[PDB]
Amino acid sequence: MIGRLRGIIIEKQPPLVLIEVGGVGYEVHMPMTCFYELPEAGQEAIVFTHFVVREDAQLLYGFNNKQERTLFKELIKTNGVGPKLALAILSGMSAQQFVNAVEREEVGALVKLPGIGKKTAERLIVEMKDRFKGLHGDLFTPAADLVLTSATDDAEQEAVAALVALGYKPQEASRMVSKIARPDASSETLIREALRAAL
Amino acid sequence: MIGRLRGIIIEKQPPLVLIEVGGVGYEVHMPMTCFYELPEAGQEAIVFTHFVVREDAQLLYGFNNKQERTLFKELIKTNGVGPKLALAILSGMSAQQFVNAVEREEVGALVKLPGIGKKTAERLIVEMKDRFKGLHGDLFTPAADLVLTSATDDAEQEAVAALVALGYKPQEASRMVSKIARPDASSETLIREALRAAL
Amino acid sequence: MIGRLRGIIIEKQPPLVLIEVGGVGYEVHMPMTCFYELPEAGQEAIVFTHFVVREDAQLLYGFNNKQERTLFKELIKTNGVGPKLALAILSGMSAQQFVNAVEREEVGALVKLPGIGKKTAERLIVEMKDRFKGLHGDLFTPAADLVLTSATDDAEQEAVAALVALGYKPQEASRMVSKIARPDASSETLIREALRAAL
Amino acid sequence: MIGRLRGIIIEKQPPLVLIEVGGVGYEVHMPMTCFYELPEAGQEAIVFTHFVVREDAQLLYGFNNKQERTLFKELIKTNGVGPKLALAILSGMSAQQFVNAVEREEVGALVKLPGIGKKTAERLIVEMKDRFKGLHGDLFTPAADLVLTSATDDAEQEAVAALVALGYKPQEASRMVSKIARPDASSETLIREALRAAL
DNA sequence: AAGTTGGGATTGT
DNA sequence: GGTTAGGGTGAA
DNA sequence: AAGTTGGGATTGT
DNA sequence: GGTTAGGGTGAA
DNA sequence: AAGTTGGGATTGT
DNA sequence: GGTTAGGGTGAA
DNA sequence: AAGTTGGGATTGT
DNA sequence: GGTTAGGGTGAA
Numbered sequence: 001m002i003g004r005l006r007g008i009i010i011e012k013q014p015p016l017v018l019i020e021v022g023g024v025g026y027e028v029h030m031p032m033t034c035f036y037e038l039p040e041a042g043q044e045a046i047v048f049t050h051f052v053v054r055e056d057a058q059l060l061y062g063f064n065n066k067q068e069r070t071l072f073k074e075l076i077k078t079n080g081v082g083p084k085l086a087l088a089i090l091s092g093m094s095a096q097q098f099v100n101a102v103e104r105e106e107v108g109a110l111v112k113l114p115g116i117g118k119k120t121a122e123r124l125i126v127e128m129k130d131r132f133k134g135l136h137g138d139l140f141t142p143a144a145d146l147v148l149t150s151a152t153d154d155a156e157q158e159a160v161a162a163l164v165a166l167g168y169k170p171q172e173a174s175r176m177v178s179k180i181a182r183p184d185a186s187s188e189t190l191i192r193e194a195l196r197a198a199l
Numbered sequence: 200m201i202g203r204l205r206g207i208i209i210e211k212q213p214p215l216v217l218i219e220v221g222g223v224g225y226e227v228h229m230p231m232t233c234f235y236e237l238p239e240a241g242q243e244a245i246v247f248t249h250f251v252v253r254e255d256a257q258l259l260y261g262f263n264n265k266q267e268r269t270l271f272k273e274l275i276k277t278n279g280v281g282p283k284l285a286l287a288i289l290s291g292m293s294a295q296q297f298v299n300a301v302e303r304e305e306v307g308a309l310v311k312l313p314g315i316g317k318k319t320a321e322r323l324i325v326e327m328k329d330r331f332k333g334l335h336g337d338l339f340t341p342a343a344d345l346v347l348t349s350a351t352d353d354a355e356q357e358a359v360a361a362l363v364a365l366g367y368k369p370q371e372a373s374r375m376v377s378k379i380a381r382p383d384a385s386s387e388t389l390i391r392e393a394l395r396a397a398l
Numbered sequence: 399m400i401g402r403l404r405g406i407i408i409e410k411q412p413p414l415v416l417i418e419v420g421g422v423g424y425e426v427h428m429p430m431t432c433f434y435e436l437p438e439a440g441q442e443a444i445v446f447t448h449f450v451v452r453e454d455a456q457l458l459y460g461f462n463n464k465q466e467r468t469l470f471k472e473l474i475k476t477n478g479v480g481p482k483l484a485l486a487i488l489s490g491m492s493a494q495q496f497v498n499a500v501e502r503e504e505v506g507a508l509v510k511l512p513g514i515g516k517k518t519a520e521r522l523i524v525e526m527k528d529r530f531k532g533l534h535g536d537l538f539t540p541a542a543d544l545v546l547t548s549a550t551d552d553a554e555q556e557a558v559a560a561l562v563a564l565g566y567k568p569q570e571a572s573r574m575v576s577k578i579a580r581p582d583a584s585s586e587t588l589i590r591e592a593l594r595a596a597l
Numbered sequence: 598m599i600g601r602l603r604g605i606i607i608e609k610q611p612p613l614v615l616i617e618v619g620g621v622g623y624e625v626h627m628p629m630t631c632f633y634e635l636p637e638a639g640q641e642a643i644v645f646t647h648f649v650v651r652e653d654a655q656l657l658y659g660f661n662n663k664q665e666r667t668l669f670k671e672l673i674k675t676n677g678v679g680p681k682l683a684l685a686i687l688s689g690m691s692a693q694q695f696v697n698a699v700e701r702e703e704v705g706a707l708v709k710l711p712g713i714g715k716k717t718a719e720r721l722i723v724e725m726k727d728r729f730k731g732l733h734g735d736l737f738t739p740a741a742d743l744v745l746t747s748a749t750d751d752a753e754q755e756a757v758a759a760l761v762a763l764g765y766k767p768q769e770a771s772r773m774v775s776k777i778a779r780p781d782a783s784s785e786t787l788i789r790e791a792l793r794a795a796l
Numbered sequence: 797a798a799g800t801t802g803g804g805a806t807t808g809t
Numbered sequence: 810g811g812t813t814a815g816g817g818t819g820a821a
Numbered sequence: 822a823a824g825t826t827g828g829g830a831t832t833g834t
Numbered sequence: 835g836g837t838t839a840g841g842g843t844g845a846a
Numbered sequence: 847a848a849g850t851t852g853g854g855a856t857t858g859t
Numbered sequence: 860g861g862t863t864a865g866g867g868t869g870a871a
Numbered sequence: 872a873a874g875t876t877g878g879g880a881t882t883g884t
Numbered sequence: 885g886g887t888t889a890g891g892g893t894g895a896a
Contacts, residue, residue: 220421419620
């Protein structure tokens, strides 16, 4: 529900920051590699956040980049992996270092991670690979999370994304968009013709 | 609890917008037909919202118009239908297009919707019809949600609404208000004489 | 957790108001007798609130006066009575009218209330009486909620209140404070000597 | 999630304060010894908070000092002890008085506490001792909560803290940091070499 | 060294 | 809360 | 009119 | 979700 | 005085 | 919600 | 083509 | 979590 926080860094107790937005100071759990980039205390920060709601607790996970947030969101989906593991994962190695490891099948590095033996280690590199690359090694090539989250147009990605939010199966979503063939239209325009055609 | 959000559109990833209110950026899930009307990023937006609270998650559903929110709230009440379906429903066709379909029994269109076969399709048009019309085809004739939500006075509608919030049965609420016969009094005044008479 | 809301009245749909605080518009459920006192839309309002948190939902109940909030909080404690009943209760009759009815055992009036037959009706007047009066008929004589919530000093009341928040039994709390005999000290000072003596 | 509140003290009803931050007034439950230090009403206050989320309720616990918050957080961990007991505990005696009692095994004082007989009394002094002292009697010697929460460097403490947040066992965390031997580096730098070495 | 018996633990239900 | 992994210890 | 058999419903668990 | 009241309807 | 039988209650599940 | 403490009352 | 056997899935509990 | 729909695939 909370997607981003923008306020003054009041305090730093890794892995958590205390950012004041208005008069309310929120606690944000951030991966060490991200934390290293937080501006000095007293400075204003902007951090994308993944909000977690439990029956007994509700925490905030933050990242400096949307891509970073996305990778983390995909990581948590992975079986056996939750907020804590992903956090540890992104403290030992950076979003890049991870991409790299999964596309270079550097299991070793992943295993030595606290709480992550061969089993999940492999799971990661497996469930994660496919998604990557479109990235072509760089985690910041354009529309990186569309890539992760959904190489064809940026707007087509976005549209396939949305169609899948609406219930269409991914095959369906893709085929549905391309049938339209218009990489140079607004992602909303595609989402719109596509729909109009589906029904 | 949250009934409206007013802030700067920070980002757009259909179907969700990221609106910053103060320093907090809220994620809002909006039907594609609504989304199409959102001002450019950077602009200020005002979106009525339906807040959903689960044990494991709490999301925000937004609409450009109160009527739009109301229709959605009625849709979710419908059996087999929840936030996601209604969202899809209002992405394939607009509040109007829906009204139209239910009052013209255009099942076809509804069936082709992702996740909505004949069964719920019919349920919709059935449970929804009665409520409509007072609307007389237009979704924006005056006090449209009173119509949906509760053709006699605007204040009588509102009052019957409230009386039903308090526990009176709808028959009761209606008869109770009209007994007062004063379409030209404040909805609060009716709610007030009515009560005074009931007790 | 939320104890008060202060913002601009954006809209009125009895029994709920939509007050904007900053950029966030909160929905507040208020008893009709209270609602009648809300300033015009567009004006700024201040409303004490009772926050309700469920597994499937979290609403806000508001009152113009702390006393009004207190009475409602005591009402909800009453067995068989919850937010909705109390709301109805305070829509049919005012905090005064209620006090009056309980201290004049006007069951009749209470029974005719929607959802409140003889059974709870009596329960009310029973569980509520004792608490009242110190009030001496007026709901706004000084420190009315201390009265309800905890005729001796205002500070002694407050202190007995706190001691009971800490685990002391009410008998204990009272006797403990008076032993101190100092109606003219700060409620905090009493809470402080009292404690110091208990341990 | 909420780690601090900064606003205007709107009202005082010990043990709870009503602080307005922006337009929202939050209720904060504070131990009497802390409460005694709150500035006059109308003044601005800053209070560290421990946010509690239940299925049926979500309250805010506040303290004037981070150390005070930390002690309370450790207290709640203690078996048989929860927010209420700790609150009572810190109403009868101050963070100091407590430290003192645990390091001087003043069971007596603890027993007389409402709800705290010999059983938990001992538990406290037992589970709490070890943690203390590094404190050397004073609760405000530098990095007191690192002490409580994690006498070697401030940055090493912090780093061991973080490593333990990530899943490393405390033995592991400690040994891991010292192996680095660099009390004069940033806690982040340690967390960083340490990790780099672990993997 | 390689498999096993267990306590601990977020994860998933 | 039960269950699956984690990764520790003991066995062969 | 007085008690009873039931569907509906917030309340309480 | 089960359970207690509410207050409707039918019985006597 | 010392142990026991119970109602009450946050705590822990 | 069940369970463990709390601390009250009654027993010996 | 029409009914059936199943995996998937929000919905409802 | 169990359950009802959804809508896929296979059968006749």
